[PDB]
Amino acid sequence: DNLEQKILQVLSDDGGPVKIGQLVKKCQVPKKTLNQVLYRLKKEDRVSSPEPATWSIG
Amino acid sequence: DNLEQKILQVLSDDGGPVKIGQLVKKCQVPKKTLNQVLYRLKKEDRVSSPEPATWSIG
RNA sequence: UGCGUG
RNA sequence: UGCGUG
Structure with missing residues (x-):
């Protein structure tokens, strides 16, 4: 929920492929x-x- | 160590294929x-x- | 090395 | 559905 929103924001602000380790940080x-x-x-x-x-966002 | 010995005893007493769930028990x-x-x-x-x-033992 | 597994 | 992952 809040984590879902955070993941979506990180992927969207990045706009490209994001590694799982980068999401952890x-x-x-x-x-x-x-x-x-x-x-x-x-x-x-x-x-x-x-x-x-x-x-990535997709 | 103690767990290694326990796994070995369970596999050897069984003598056949043992499922991971049976080892958990x-x-x-x-x-x-x-x-x-x-x-x-x-x-x-x-x-x-x-x-x-x-x-299994092997 | 992918691991999310219930 | 294999999951042991460091």
Whole structure:
């Protein structure tokens, strides 16, 4: 929810492929917690994964 | 160490393929903790994995 | 090395 | 669904 919004803001401000480690630094939660949301967002066609462990708005 | 010995005893007393969930019940530690040792034991040719998430003496 | 796993 | 990941 708040984490979902933070992930969306980081991906949108970046505008390009973002590595999971870079999201950890910006979102201040562990990789597993990020990936739970990222894969849910992916299912929802809110984000895309152009590369392994790499995420973008899509 | 003690967990390694417990895993070895459970696999040897069983004598056949053992599922990771069955090891959890006997060894009273989580699947990740079991798998850390199991894959180290596998590297050491002390156990084998005849099937995914399935383990035996080998 | 991808790991999200329930 | 394999997950051991450092």
